[PDB]
Design a protein around this ligand. Structure first.
Ligand SMILES: Nc1nc2c(ncn2[C@@H]2O[C@H](COP(=O)(O)OP(=O)(O)OP(=O)(O)O)[C@@H](O)[C@H]2O)c(=O)[nH]1
Ligand SMILES: [Mg+2]
Lengths: 876, 170
């Protein structure tokens, strides 16, 4: 039927209607492209059509003329170039005549102009667009809508197209932009469109920005436009200034001094949220660019070269006026304000943190008098600003300077923990948590640690917003005290430490914090569980009975979760039940790594009964089947070789987890469980080995499998081979064939998403070969007849590692596994492996790179491989 | 009273999972690719009467894009969701913002860094600087652990209605 009907159908929120419209558009596009594009261009250029239909036709032309993928974009551009010139000329005429006929505030035909121009300009088949746009903008008789649409199309063209096409005629483009931006323009919308067009074209006019006069003209026009009475034009001009400083930082030294500083300070002082936020973000961007240039200068100094760009420290020179304005804006709050509200107050706090990280100790004397003045101010806003500034200046200055200040202010912080104001208490808890994070030695101080702990355990009973940072401070303080433990010891765990005097009270208060009915708010229950896991991970051996009692409490809670399967009534009760399952299983994983073997032996039966009950509840496909697998893995790591009693009952659930493969996390967890089972059981997993190897072979090819799943499968191939020794020869040939097929595959090295994937895949391939060779070589004797089956595969293995060493991205793990594989092949075959390694000179270069590599394990394995090569050279 | 929302991002960064978690409650674990678009209304109750968001769950894959930018017609609010665990999901956020602003005039946009319950984050909270540049609202969110799962809709309701003193009286 009529195309306008489908174009208006493209907006209705009905699934079948939208699918029918999409299928009709796809069929019309496939069937005959030029007539379809001509009809679309004739629909778009009609002013009598509805706005929805016109914008839909414009977007249809655009997304049939360009796409996000560059290869598909180039293919569509060439397909457009393959169209006959008459139809293209008609489409271009209709699209160019569409400009100025739009009452819509965003231009729809401008995207069509950009999409057509990005294909026509490199062939120069439309040498009339730029003069037409320039004559449209520069004509004094042009209307507001026509000027706005032409400027928007100019901005879209300059953004989307490659910069090496319109480099010759960019001067007239910038002349039109400057003419449309200047103060004499009566309409504010034209000024806004001109500023947005300049914002888009700032990355295009780099060659024009290299010229001094045009740069001066652009800077003068932008500085004039910053003083616009309209707010949106001011915001756009400030965004243009931000992007100019981001892109052209090397040319602002002439202009930022006398011109930009007053404008940006006046923007910061503005009571309008947008303008003040934009000025704060301007100086935050200054700090970001300055610290990036500092990182670049440090890297250049490490290489003994001058940096490419030298910073001039604008924020460091402007600190004297930045700090009082930021602290004054930090006093702007309300009784009902969220934390991440992103008001000018939050922006000012973020900018203060950035300024601290950028300027180190130069921010302390400019902000200390504000804290000293308003640490006891009767109005809560100024005390809140003082404690917020004190929290924000923690990161970046040297902690030795900050230590007397925080020591002096610690009783004041303790008193402000009991402040009547809620916001002051929240910011004080935030400051205490940041103190425990950044400067941990101040928190563990014998003068004030006991009132601090009392205030913390009282704040666990406070509001959830307070208690979140209270428990975070508890976890960080536990980490700090654990790192401050082990005075002499020379053991794996400390005997006792600072929190041992109240560890039982702390864990009891955390357990009561878990059972808070308001724990759902501000993720309080999850934060309390994380704090409990972190403090039970960082605990001494004298607190072990408290750990055992906590483990018993967690086990009883898990049993209560077991007994409420029939209590599932609503969806948003069973999902909280699933969340409790995940949290309790993670808690069991954290606490079981700290308990002793003998004490966990009695509880392991009940734990396995609970996990088997949860597996029976989740026998059908999935459900959760993720946290329970790693819980079983932790139980296996606790027990060891005595886990074989429950292996017969555990076989079908592990089989289901291996057969499922519809979730990458669940399959990865089951694979890690298989590896841990092999490590714990050694040769006792052989009766289940055939079944799990059949499942792994079935899931091996399996082209609809997530990328991270396959390296884990290869890793446990190596683990199974190393565990079972010479019994792998039943499926050794098939495993070697599939590993050869996997290693022969290679992906693109351009995008960095697959770079880590290919590194992990190659590392897993080397690990699998290492495990196979180590298993087939025995453990203590000489070379074995089992490794003679993999003897023709040594050539392909060394060819694959030669291809890996040809690639120059690399990581420590691939070289470490390669060195281990080389040493194992040397010890398994003698002079043949040495000769085939010497046939490939890149192997020695890879070993030299590994010896160069700073990883101790990788360097040790490379040294061992080089020693094996030297011994084989000296053998004969 | 209802609004129109567009949920954009790369391929299955958490958009369909977050919509399903907010709609029924269950956390779907399997990765099912969205075929073109999904329209799922979400209901919230505030202190000034209930509202409704028509979350247009667009597809983040180029093969199944469908109408692509054609879903942005007459949009009133926008949520740009990206996976924290993948950096290329954050790197395409300016492209989605550019496609939003070329069809929508003055529409408030809320960033969402999804799936922060993963212990290792490839995109740190310090490096997320795009919300600062375009005066956007940012929330750290996770559809699995219910981390801030009602905050973006709360901010959007406050911005569209104009009442900062609005709270989800669930
Ligand atoms: N850890 C964690 N993982 C998540 C979470 N939410 C989603 N995921 C994972 O991310 C995937 C989400 O897939 P989708 O949301 O459907 O992908 P999409 O962005 O909608 O794009 P489409 O493929 O077009 O549907 C799921 O398979 C989960 O494995 C989360 O909250 N936490
Ligand atoms: Mg999707």
């Amino acid at each position: 039927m009529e195309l306008i009907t489908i174009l208006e159908k493209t907006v209705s929120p009905d699934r079948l209607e939208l699918e029918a419209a999409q299928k009709f558009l796809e069929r019309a596009a496939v069937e005959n492209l030029p007539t379809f594009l001509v009809e679309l261009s004739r629909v778009l250029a009609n002013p009598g059509n509805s706005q929805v239909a016109r914008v839909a036709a414009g977007l249809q032309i655009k997304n049939s003329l360009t796409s996000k993928d560059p290869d598909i974009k180039a293919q569509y551009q060439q397909r457009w170039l393959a169209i006959d010139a008459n139809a293209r000329r008609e489409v271009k005429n209709y699209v160019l005549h569409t400009l100025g006929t739009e009452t819509y505030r965003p231009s729809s035909a401008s995207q069509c102009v950009a999409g057509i121009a990005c294909a026509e300009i490199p062939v120069n088949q439309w040498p009339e667009l730029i003069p037409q746009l320039v004559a449209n903008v520069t004509n004094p008789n042009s209307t507001e809508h026509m000027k706005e649409s032409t400027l928007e199309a100019i901005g879209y063209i300059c953004q989307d197209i490659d910069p090496e096409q319109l480099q010759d005629k960019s001067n007239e483009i910038l002349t039109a932009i400057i003419q449309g931006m200047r103060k004499e323009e009566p309409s504010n919308n034209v000024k806004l469109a001109a500023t947005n067009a300049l914002l888009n074209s700032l990355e295009f006019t780099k060659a024009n920005f290299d010229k001094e006069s045009e740069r001066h003209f652009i800077m003068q026009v932008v500085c004039e436009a910053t003083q616009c009475p309209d707010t949106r034009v001011r915001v756009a001009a400030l965004q243009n200034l931000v992007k100019i400083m981001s892109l052209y930082y090397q040319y602002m030294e002439t202009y930022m001094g006398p011109a930009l500083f007053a404008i940006t300070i006046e923007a910061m002082k503005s009571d309008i949220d947008e303008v003040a936020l934009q000025g704060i973000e301007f100086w935050s961007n200054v700090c970001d660019e300055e610290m990036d240039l500092a990182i670049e200068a440090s890297e250049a100094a490490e290489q003994g070269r001058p940096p490419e760009h030298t910073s001039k420290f604008y924020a460091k020179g402007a600190l004297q006026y930045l700090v009082p304005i930021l602290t004054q804006t930090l006093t702007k709050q309300d009784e009902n304000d969220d934390d991440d509200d992103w008001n000018p107050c939050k922006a000012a706090g973020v900018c203060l943190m950035l300024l601290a990280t950028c300027c180190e100790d130069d921010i302390v004397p400019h902000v200390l008098p504000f804290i000293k003045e308003h640490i006891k101010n009767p109005d809560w806003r100024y005390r809140d600003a003082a404690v917020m500034a004190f929290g924000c200046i923690l990161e970046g200055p040297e902690p030795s300077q900050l230590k007397p200040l925080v020591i002096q202010a610690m009783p004041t912080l303790i008193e402000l923990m009991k402040d009547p104001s809620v916001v002051v208490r929240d910011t004080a808890a935030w400051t205490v948590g940041r103190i425990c994070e950044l400067l941990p030695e101040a928190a563990i101080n014998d003068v004030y640690l006991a009132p601090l702990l009392q205030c913390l355990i009282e704040g666990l009973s406070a509001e959830p917003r307070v208690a979140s940072n209270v428990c975070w401070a508890f976890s960080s303080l536990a980490e700090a005290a654990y790192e401050a433990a082990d005075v002499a010891d020379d053991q794996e765990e400390p005997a006792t430490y600072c929190l041992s005097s109240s560890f039982e009270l702390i864990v009891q208060k955390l357990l009561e914090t878990t059972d808070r009915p308001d724990g759902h708010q501000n993720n309080l229950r999850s934060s309390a569980y994380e704090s409990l896991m972190e403090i039970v991970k960082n605990s001494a051996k004298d607190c072990y009975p408290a750990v055992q009692k906590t483990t018993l409490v967690i086990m009883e809670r898990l049993q209560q979760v077991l007994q409420m399967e029939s209590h599932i009534q609503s969806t948003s009760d069973r999902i909280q039940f699933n969340d409790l399952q995940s949290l309790l299983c993670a808690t069991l994983q954290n606490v079981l790594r700290k308990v002793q073997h003998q004490d966990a032996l009695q509880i392991s039966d009940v734990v396995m009964a609970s996990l088997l009950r949860m597996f029976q509840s989740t026998a059908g496909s999935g459900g959760v089947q993720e946290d329970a697998l790693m819980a079983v893995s932790t139980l296996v790591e606790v027990l060891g070789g005595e886990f074989l009693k429950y292996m017969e009952a555990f076989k079908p659930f592990l089989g289901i987890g291996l057969k499922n493969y519809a979730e990458y996390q669940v399959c990865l967890a089951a694979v890690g469980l298989v590896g841990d089972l092999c490590r714990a059981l050694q040769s006792n997993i052989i009766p289940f080995c055939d079944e799990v190897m059949q499942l792994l072979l079935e899931n091996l090819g399996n082209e609809n499998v997530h990328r991270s799943v396959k390296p884990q499968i290869l890793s446990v191939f190596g683990d199974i081979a190393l565990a079972i020794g010479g019994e792998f020869k039943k499926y050794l040939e098939v495993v070697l064939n599939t590993l050869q097929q996997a290693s022969q595959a290679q992906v693109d090295k351009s995008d960095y998403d697959m770079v880590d994937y290919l590194n992990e895949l190659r590392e897993s391939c080397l690990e699998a070969y290492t495990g196979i060779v180590q298993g087939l070589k025995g453990d203590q004797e000489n070379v074995h007849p089992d490794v003679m089956l993999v003897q023709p595969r040594v050539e392909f293995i060394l060819s694959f590692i030669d291809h890996i060493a040809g690639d120059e991205d690399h990581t420590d793990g691939v070289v470490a596994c390669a060195a281990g594989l080389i040493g194992d092949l040397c010890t398994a075959f003698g002079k043949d492996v040495l000769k085939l390694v010497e046939a490939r000179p890149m192997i020695h270069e890879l070993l030299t790179e590994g010896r160069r590599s700073k990883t101790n394990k990788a360097k040790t394995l490379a040294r061992w491989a080089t020693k094996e090569l030297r011994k084989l050279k000296n053998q004969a | 009273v209802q609004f129109k929302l567009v949920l954009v991002g790369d391929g299955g960064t958490g958009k369909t999972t977050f919509v399903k978690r907010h709609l029924t409650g269950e956390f779907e674990k399997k990765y099912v690719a969205t075929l073109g678009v999904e329209v799922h209304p979400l209901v919230f109750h505030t202190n000034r009467g209930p509202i409704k968001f028509n979350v247009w769950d667009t597809a983040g894959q180029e093969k199944f894009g469908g109408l692509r930018d054609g879903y942005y017609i007459q949009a009133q609010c926008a949520i740009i969701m990206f996976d924290v665990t993948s950096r290329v999901t954050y790197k395409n956020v300016p492209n989605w913002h550019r496609d939003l602003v070329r069809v929508c005039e003055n529409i408030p946009i809320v960033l969402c860094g999804n799936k922060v319950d993963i212990k290792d984050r490839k995109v740190k909270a310090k490096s997320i600087v795009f919300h600062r540049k375009k005066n956007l609202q940012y929330y750290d969110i996770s559809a699995k652990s219910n981390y801030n799962f009602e905050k973006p809709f709360l901010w959007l309701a406050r911005k569209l209605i104009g009442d900062p003193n609005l709270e989800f009286a669930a």
